[PDB]
Amino acid sequence: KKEIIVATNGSPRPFIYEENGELTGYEIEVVRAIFKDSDKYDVKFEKTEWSGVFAGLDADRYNMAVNNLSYTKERAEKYLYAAPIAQNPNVLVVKKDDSSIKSLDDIGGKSTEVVQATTSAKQLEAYNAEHTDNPTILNYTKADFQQIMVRLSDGQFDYKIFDKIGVETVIKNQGLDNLKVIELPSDQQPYVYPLLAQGQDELKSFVDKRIKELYKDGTLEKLSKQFFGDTYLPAEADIK
């Protein structure tokens, strides 16, 4: 069979995480189900640093990637997007005792920690290009999401933008009960997608076909409830 290597950096829970030395989480199990009993393909998951996920797709080292990945035009120019597999809205996190940040309009002169090449880093970089008189303070980090949330709770900086499921998960698991969650709007549907290397066109056709099948047989809903506690799926009409 043809071996398909799926890369991930291992964050964030419950989309991706490790248990007993092995990768699991919603996206990992959705991909396992896509290839289960495939007469053509065998799947293998590999954990690598974040920058390595994209660099590996670029070099054709990896066939696919799952990593709580959002859509952007820039990514679409370099990689293929499979059908979406989850819907998860954006949020702004601040300390509950801080009344100075109530929306995304209040981040000027305030500090955060962001990861290179993420959609939130790109949004904030663009915010700074527009608001040159009072930019937000970005400190880039290679730490993963949980660590960043802990630092926010520790008072190391003022706010953090991320998504609902990832934020709620860390607030519950890490007991970060001093953090307040503010809903944020979205221009586009906040969907999460597997990405494939450019040229993996035949693979994309198979993956897309399987994602639709797993939606129809109830597997996506089953896995969503298992990992997230409720159904967080794209509308059926957008699953393509």
Among candidate residues 77, 232, 226, 76, the one with its CA nearest the CA of residue 165: 232
Asked if 87 touches ligand GSH (CB under 6 A), the answer is no
119 is in an annotated binding site: yes
Work out which of 4, 7, 9, 203 binds ligand GSH, going by CB under 6 A. 9
Interface positions, 158-217, toward ligand GSH (CB under 6 A): 162
Phi/psi of residue 73, nearest 5 degrees: -60, -40
Work out which of 115, 124, 165, 233 binds ligand GSH, going by CB under 6 A. 115
Residue holding tokens 């790109």?
Answer: 122
Asked if 120 touches ligand GSH (CB under 6 A), the answer is yes
Cα–Cα distance list, 118 to 24, 37, 201 (Å): 22, 34, 25
24 is in an annotated binding site: no
Contact by Cβ (8 Å): 107, 152: no
Asked if 118 touches ligand GSH (CB under 6 A), the answer is yes
Interface with ligand GSH (CB under 6 A), residue total: 16
Contact by Cβ (8 Å): 182, 94: yes
Asked if 11 touches ligand GSH (CB under 6 A), the answer is yes
CB under 6 A: which stretch of 79-87, 103-111, 118-126, 203-211 binds ligand GSH? 118-126
The binding track of 132-151 with respect to ligand GSH, each residue x by CB under 6 A or -, is ------------xx--x---
Pairing of strands 111-114, 137-140: parallel
- Write the single-letter amino acid at 218: G
Interface positions, 40-79, toward ligand GSH (CB under 6 A): 50, 67-70
Q: How far is the CB of 144 from ligand GSH (least distance, A)?
A: 5
Work out which of 119, 153, 169, 219 binds ligand GSH, going by CB under 6 A. 119
Residue holding tokens 């996506």?
Answer: 220
DSSP, collapsed to helix, strand or coil, labels residue 147 as helix
Residue 182, beta-bridge partner list: 92
Give whichever of 151 and 206 is closer to ligand GSH, judged by the CB atom.
151
Asked if 80 touches ligand GSH (CB under 6 A), the answer is no
Q: Which two tokens stand for residue 114?
A: 């962001």
CA 199, distance to chain mean position in Å, is 23
Which residues sit at the interface with ligand GSH, rule CB under 6 A? 9, 11-12, 50, 67-70, 115, 118-120, 144-145, 148, 162
